[PDB]
Design a protein around this ligand. Structure first.
Ligand code: HEM
Ligand code: HEM
Lengths: 126, 129
């Protein structure tokens, strides 16, 4: 179970990476390919990653009791938001999106929720 | 292009949500913090290499020596995956051929079915510890 999950996640990661690089291949510029590879392996590929509960309050990695406005909006509107920020001197893109409350989640979650929380991920675009 | 970066970022977010969905349905909600550390670590993308139609690496380390795995992926037109212990961790390396899709054909003559290959290595140690 734990291994299958790890394997599934790994295969999806590979799918993501080739789809990502396909966009760079479309440029017909080797320079762009080299830079992408360096960027995805770097520590700034995923500079931040936080998961929030339905109340827009962070749960992982650092539990908080203060709601995150962007998450609040993403959940309320049920849409993905994105905004630029300069973090530790780097230009980045942050995405905030809600977790759809699929029927299968009802076993442990409120079946009536539209969304079960949010995710915030920040990646460098330097 | 910012739009390309955004599209890619969007799919990254999608992967993460799909990954966490897995931990949840498997009853492993408590492993999310560990998942996050792993995703931000240098072990997420442990290696990434691109090869041409002759299975020779073009980036980031140009080589004239063919990669047997890539070679088979391209010749067979299929994705190969193998477990390997690297950098002190149990990992999964996936070898994928680049299909010459319609959009690609605007430059690559449709004669070739695949244009090369990609190797990606990620840690799967979390699956054991
Ligand atoms: C694909 C359906 C599901 C989705 C989208 C989902 C989503 C979420 C989200 C976004 C959170 C809040 C943030 C976090 O704790 O990291 C959460 C918390 C939680 N989920 Fe789920 N979940 C799903 C299925 C499940 C299932 C089936 C279980 C029961 C086996 C479960 C048990 C929990 C628990 C125990 C928490 C509390 C975690 C904590 O605060 O420490 N979830 N879930
Ligand atoms: C998603 C569709 C595409 C894929 C999958 C693709 C794949 C590849 C692969 C695997 C290589 C050899 C490895 C490498 O040099 O990195 C390559 C080289 C190349 N491709 Fe593409 N390609 C695509 C679209 C395009 C387009 C649309 C153009 C023209 C605008 C193009 C122009 C080139 C050029 C010029 C090279 C030679 C190396 C260089 O970039 O200087 N490719 N392509």
């Amino acid at each position: 179970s734990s291994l299958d999950l790890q394997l599934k996640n790994a295969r999806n990661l590979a799918g993501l990476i080739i789809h990502d690089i396909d966009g760079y291949m479309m440029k017909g510029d080797s320079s762009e390919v080299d830079r992408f590879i360096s960027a995805v392996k770097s520590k700034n590929f995923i500079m931040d990653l936080r998961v929030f509960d339905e109340q827009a309050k962070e749960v992982s990695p650092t539990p908080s009791q203060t709601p995150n406005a962007k998450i609040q909006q993403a959940i309320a509107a049920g849409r993905t938001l994105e905004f630029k920020e300069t973090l530790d001197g780097k230009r980045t893109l942050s995405l905030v999106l809600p977790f759809p409350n699929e029927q299968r989640c009802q076993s442990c979650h409120d079946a009536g929720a539209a969304y079960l929380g949010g995710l915030l991920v920040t990646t460098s675009i330097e």
